[PDB]
Design a protein around this ligand. Structure first.
Ligand SMILES: CCc1nnsc1C(=O)N(CC)CC
Lengths: 300, 237
């Protein structure tokens, strides 16, 4: 079980770890988060009490280092940092635990929500989407734009998701215009899976990461990316059977975890209606269709 | 964006453009099978591709053999239209290629867009005008060449005959759309008006009769009456 200690909490902030969120008052004696499950990526995120503008946070994996949070009064945010001195860190953590100044990541997940949301998400892939090689962890916030959004500005702060564009030469084989536009299997299976992502696990990892940035930070480009990766599968007549079954499990847990009051913004009517009711795979997403019907039948 | 009443003069500027109408590409007669069920039999169609400034018409004839053994023909027709328009553009010298293509029906946008991916600087535009180009098959010479075709074939016409020697493109397009709107609303009356006087003929190299300027005014006025009429006969006004 790993720990992310906090130097202090000088400004009133809502702190979330995974799908859990808690409020910390100004200068409250808060000194971090313990009992974090090993073996998964995690995200710690922040919304200040005084400016709900800018949700921001950090993706990390405690196997890759000892990480802590410290408020910076110049840049005005909670920053993640790495402590290289292993014994300085265990000592900090041990003393904070002894004074019981750390909240505990909750132990029971009867439905393992977090595993199911991050099953294919790896740190190494996150670090290629979010480029900042001097740090082992990755900063993301509400306002960051995607490479594709930038095409249609600062590249050092972009989300480098894989570009998907259904009316592009990459998507459409010359001479197969109609075939490839109405059945995107060649773009899914040959261009993206075999060529770009190499396997479906990596495709699913980017799809899951895009969803999580959309949900936790309201990142619009990430929501665009999540829906495009869904639509590319649902609009392919030929999809490996293991992928379709896994996709149903993936989307089910994403829809299950979504705030009920955010479905007006984070869910794209057109994509979901086409995917569940018109696409080639309209019949291959029973659990996702079941939970979308019993939870957002308005959208449909 | 979309072409409408507000930006109508843009059709006659010096940027090359083409209208594409696909309404006569897939044509059928619906009939009864010996078992009493209904079947369609296709007849020859055409893509109507028109330069509104010069009157040049690229009439691509769509022979019924193109549908043999194909499914979902109304959807295929849109993609066949876009394939043939893209082939026409690639056949033209660069300085003759259009800068815009305006489709008369919005369902042609994605098919044409995908076939023209190689041409990123050719704008594909819908329109809010309800143009009467479906009535092109009421022009006897165009109908005749479509029905007689035994293979795929491109035929070139000038739909303005020699009008541009005496009138502007704006005025010629207005006359054309009036004639076609009349043929669409009441083809019989329209054709009666155009041929009523046996002394005005159609030149072998023309599509319409050789009216003097004065006779065109008379004709145009008779066509307006017909259109308003039918708009009464229809609506009872
Ligand atoms: C996420 C750790 C945590 N920190 N403060 S309360 C709390 C917790 O266990 N919760 C939030 C009430 C369970 C839903």
């Amino acid at each position: 079980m790993n720990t992310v200690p906090f130097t202090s909490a000088p400004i009133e902030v809502t702190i979330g770890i995974d799908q859990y969120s808690f409020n910390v008052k100004e200068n409250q004696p808060f000194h971090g988060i313990k009992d974090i499950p090993i073996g998964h990526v995690h995200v710690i995120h922040f919304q200040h009490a005084d400016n709900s503008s800018m949700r921001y946070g950090y993706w990390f994996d405690c196997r890759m280092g000892n990480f802590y949070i410290q408020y910076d009064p110049k840049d005005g945010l909670y920053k993640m940092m790495e402590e290289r001195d292993g014994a300085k860190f265990e000592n900090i953590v041990h003393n904070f635990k002894e004074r019981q100044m750390m909240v505990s990541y909750p132990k029971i997940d009867e439905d393992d929500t977090w595993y199911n949301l991050t099953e294919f998400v790896q740190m190494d892939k996150i670090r290629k989407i979010v480029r900042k090689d001097e740090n082992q962890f990755s900063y993301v916030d509400s306002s960051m734009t995607t490479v594709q959004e930038n095409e249609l500005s600062d590249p050092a702060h972009s989300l480098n998701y894989t570009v998907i564009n259904f009316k592009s030469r990459e998507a459409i084989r010359p001479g197969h215009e109609m075939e490839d536009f109405l059945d995107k299997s060649y773009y899914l299976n040959t261009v993206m899976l075999q060529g770009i992502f190499k396997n479906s696990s990596n495709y699913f990892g980017e799809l899951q990461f895009a969803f999580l940035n959309a949900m936790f930070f309201g990142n619009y480009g990430s929501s665009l990316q999540w829906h495009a990766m869904i639509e590319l599968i649902c609009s392919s007549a030929t999809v490996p059977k293991h992928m379709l079954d896994k996709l149903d499990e993936i989307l089910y847990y994403q829809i299950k975890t979504l705030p009920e009051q955010y479905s007006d913004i984070l869910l794209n009517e057109r994509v979901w209606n086409i995917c569940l009711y018109s696409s080639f795979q309209k019949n291959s997403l029973h659990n996702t269709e079941k939970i979308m019907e019993n939870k957002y039948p308005e959208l449909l | 964006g979309a072409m409408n009443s507000s930006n109508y003069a843009e059709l006659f500027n010096n940027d090359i453009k083409l209208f594409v109408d696909d309404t006569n590409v897939y044509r059928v007669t619906v009939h009864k099978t010996f078992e009493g069920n209904v079947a369609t039999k296709a007849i020859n169609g055409c893509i109507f591709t028109l330069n509104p400034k010069t009157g040049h018409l690229f009439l691509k004839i769509i022979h019924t053999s193109v549908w043999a053994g194909q499914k979902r023909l109304s959807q295929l027709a849109k993609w066949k239209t876009a394939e043939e328009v893209s082939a026409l553009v690639r056949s033209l010298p660069k300085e003759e290629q259009p800068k815009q293509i305006i489709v008369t029906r919005k369902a042609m946008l994605d098919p044409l867009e995908v076939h023209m991916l190689d041409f990123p600087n050719i704008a594909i535009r819908p329109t809010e005008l309800r143009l009467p180009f479906s009535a092109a098959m009421s022009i006897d010479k165009l109908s005749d060449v479509v029905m007689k075709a035994t293979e795929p074939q491109m035929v070139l016409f000038n739909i303005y005959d020699d009008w541009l020697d005496r009138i502007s493109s704006y005025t010629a397009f207005s006359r054309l759309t009036l004639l076609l709107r009349a043929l669409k609303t009441n083809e019989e009356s329209a054709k009666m008006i155009l041929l009523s006087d046996p002394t005005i003929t159609i030149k072998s190299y023309h599509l319409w009769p050789s009216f003097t300027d004065e006779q065109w005014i008379t004709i145009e006025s008779q066509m307006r009456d017909l259109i308003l009429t039918e708009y009464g006969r229809k609506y009872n006004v």
